[PDB]
mmCIF file with all atom_site columns, C-alpha atoms and ligand atoms in Angstrom:
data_model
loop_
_atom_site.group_PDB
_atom_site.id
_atom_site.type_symbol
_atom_site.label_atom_id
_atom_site.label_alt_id
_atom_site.label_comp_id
_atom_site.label_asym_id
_atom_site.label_entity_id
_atom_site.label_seq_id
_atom_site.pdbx_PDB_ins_code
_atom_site.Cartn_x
_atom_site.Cartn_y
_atom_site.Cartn_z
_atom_site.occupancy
_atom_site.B_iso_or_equiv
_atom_site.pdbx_formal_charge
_atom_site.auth_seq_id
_atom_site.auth_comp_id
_atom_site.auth_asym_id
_atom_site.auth_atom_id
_atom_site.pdbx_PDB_model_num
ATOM   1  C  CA  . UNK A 1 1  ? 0.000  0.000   0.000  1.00 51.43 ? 23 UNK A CA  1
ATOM   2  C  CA  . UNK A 1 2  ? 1.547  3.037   -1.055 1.00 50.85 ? 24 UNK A CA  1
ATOM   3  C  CA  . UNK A 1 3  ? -1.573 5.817   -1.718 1.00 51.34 ? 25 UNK A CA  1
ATOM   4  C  CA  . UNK A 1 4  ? -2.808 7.303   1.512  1.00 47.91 ? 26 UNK A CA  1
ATOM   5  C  CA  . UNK A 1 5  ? -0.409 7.565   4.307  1.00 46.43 ? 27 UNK A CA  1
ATOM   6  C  CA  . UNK A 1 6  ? 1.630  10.566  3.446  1.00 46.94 ? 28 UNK A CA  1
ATOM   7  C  CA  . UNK A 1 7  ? 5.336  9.197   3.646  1.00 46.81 ? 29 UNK A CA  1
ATOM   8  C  CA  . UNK A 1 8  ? 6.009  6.013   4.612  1.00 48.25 ? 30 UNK A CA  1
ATOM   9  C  CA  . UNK A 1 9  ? 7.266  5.667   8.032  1.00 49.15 ? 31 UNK A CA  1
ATOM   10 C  CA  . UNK A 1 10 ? 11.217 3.606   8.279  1.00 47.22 ? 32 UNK A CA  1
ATOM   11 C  CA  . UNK A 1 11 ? 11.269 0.718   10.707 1.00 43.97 ? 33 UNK A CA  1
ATOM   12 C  CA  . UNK A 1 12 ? 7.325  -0.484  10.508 1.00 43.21 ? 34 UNK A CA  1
ATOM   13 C  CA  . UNK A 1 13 ? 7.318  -0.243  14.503 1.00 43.93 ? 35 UNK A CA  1
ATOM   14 C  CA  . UNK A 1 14 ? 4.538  -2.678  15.223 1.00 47.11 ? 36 UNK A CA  1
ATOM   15 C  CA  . UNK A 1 15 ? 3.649  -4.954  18.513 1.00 48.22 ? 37 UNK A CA  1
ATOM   16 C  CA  . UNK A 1 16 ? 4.224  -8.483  17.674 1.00 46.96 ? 38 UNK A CA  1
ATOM   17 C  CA  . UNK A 1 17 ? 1.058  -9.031  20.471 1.00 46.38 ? 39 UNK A CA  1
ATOM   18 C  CA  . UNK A 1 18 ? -1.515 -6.670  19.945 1.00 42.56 ? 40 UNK A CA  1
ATOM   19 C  CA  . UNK A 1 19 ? -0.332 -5.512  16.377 1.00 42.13 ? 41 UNK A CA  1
ATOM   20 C  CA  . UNK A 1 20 ? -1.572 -1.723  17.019 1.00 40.66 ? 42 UNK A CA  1
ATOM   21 C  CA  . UNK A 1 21 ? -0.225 1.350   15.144 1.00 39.24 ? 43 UNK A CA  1
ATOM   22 C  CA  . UNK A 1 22 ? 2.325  3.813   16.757 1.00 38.96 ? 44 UNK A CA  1
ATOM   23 C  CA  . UNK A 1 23 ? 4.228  6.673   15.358 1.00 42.07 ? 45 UNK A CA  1
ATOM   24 C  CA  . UNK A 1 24 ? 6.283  7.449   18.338 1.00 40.76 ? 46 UNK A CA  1
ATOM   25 C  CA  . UNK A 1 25 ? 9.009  5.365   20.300 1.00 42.65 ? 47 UNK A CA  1
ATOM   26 C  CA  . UNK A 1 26 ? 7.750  6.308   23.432 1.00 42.80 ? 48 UNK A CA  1
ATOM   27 C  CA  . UNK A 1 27 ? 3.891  5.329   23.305 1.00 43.25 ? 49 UNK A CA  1
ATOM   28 C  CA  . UNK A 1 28 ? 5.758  1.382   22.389 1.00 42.87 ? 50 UNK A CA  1
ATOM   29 C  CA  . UNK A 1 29 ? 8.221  1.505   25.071 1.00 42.90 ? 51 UNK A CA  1
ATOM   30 C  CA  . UNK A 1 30 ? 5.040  1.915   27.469 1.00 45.56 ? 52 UNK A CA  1
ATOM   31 C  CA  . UNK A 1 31 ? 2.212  0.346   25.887 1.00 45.07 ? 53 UNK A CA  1
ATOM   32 C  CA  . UNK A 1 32 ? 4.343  -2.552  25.529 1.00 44.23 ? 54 UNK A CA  1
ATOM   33 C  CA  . UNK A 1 33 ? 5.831  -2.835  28.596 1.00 47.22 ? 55 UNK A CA  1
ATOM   34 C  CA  . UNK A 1 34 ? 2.156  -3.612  29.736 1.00 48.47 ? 56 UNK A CA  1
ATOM   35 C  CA  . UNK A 1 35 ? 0.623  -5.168  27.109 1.00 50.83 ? 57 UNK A CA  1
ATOM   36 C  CA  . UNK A 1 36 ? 3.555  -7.240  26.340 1.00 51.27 ? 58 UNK A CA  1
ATOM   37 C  CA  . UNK A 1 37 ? 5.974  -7.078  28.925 1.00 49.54 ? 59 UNK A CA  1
ATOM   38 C  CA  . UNK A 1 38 ? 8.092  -10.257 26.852 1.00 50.46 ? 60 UNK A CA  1
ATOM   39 C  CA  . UNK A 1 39 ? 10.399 -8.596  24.383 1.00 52.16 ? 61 UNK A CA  1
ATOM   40 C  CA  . UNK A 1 40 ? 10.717 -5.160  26.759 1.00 52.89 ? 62 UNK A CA  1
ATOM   41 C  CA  . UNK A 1 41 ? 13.995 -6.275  28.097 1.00 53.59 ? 63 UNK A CA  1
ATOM   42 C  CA  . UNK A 1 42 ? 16.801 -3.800  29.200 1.00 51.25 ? 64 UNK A CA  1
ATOM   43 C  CA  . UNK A 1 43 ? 19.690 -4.264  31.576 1.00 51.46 ? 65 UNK A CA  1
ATOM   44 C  CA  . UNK A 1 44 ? 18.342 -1.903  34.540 1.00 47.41 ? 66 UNK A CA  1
ATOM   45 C  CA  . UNK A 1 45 ? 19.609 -3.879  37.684 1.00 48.36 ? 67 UNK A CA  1
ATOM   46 C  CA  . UNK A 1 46 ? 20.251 -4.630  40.297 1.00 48.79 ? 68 UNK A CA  1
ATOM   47 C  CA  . UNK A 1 47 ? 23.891 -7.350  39.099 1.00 50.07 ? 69 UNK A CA  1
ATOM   48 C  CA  . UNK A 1 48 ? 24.699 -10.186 39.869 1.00 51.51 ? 70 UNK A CA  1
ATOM   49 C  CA  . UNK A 1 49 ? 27.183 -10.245 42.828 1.00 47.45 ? 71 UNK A CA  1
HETATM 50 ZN ZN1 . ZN  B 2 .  ? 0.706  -4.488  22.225 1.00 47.78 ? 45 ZN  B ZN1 1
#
């Protein structure tokens, strides 16, 4: 599909759950992190010791 949305947007960011449409990085990070808090992974801590 090319007619309608005006420019394509790089790296089709879509949730591999849900499958909604987001423009920004931000509304992912959290919506995900909710809805599916599987592939939100970052090293945050605590270490291991
Ligand atoms: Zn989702």
């Amino acid at each position: 599909g090319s007619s309608g949305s005006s420019g394509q947007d790089g790296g089709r960011k879509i949730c591999p759950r849900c499958n909604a449409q987001f423009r920004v990085t931000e509304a992912l990070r959290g919506h995900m992190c909710y809805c599916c808090p599987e592939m939100v992974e970052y090293q945050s801590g605590p270490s291991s010791g």
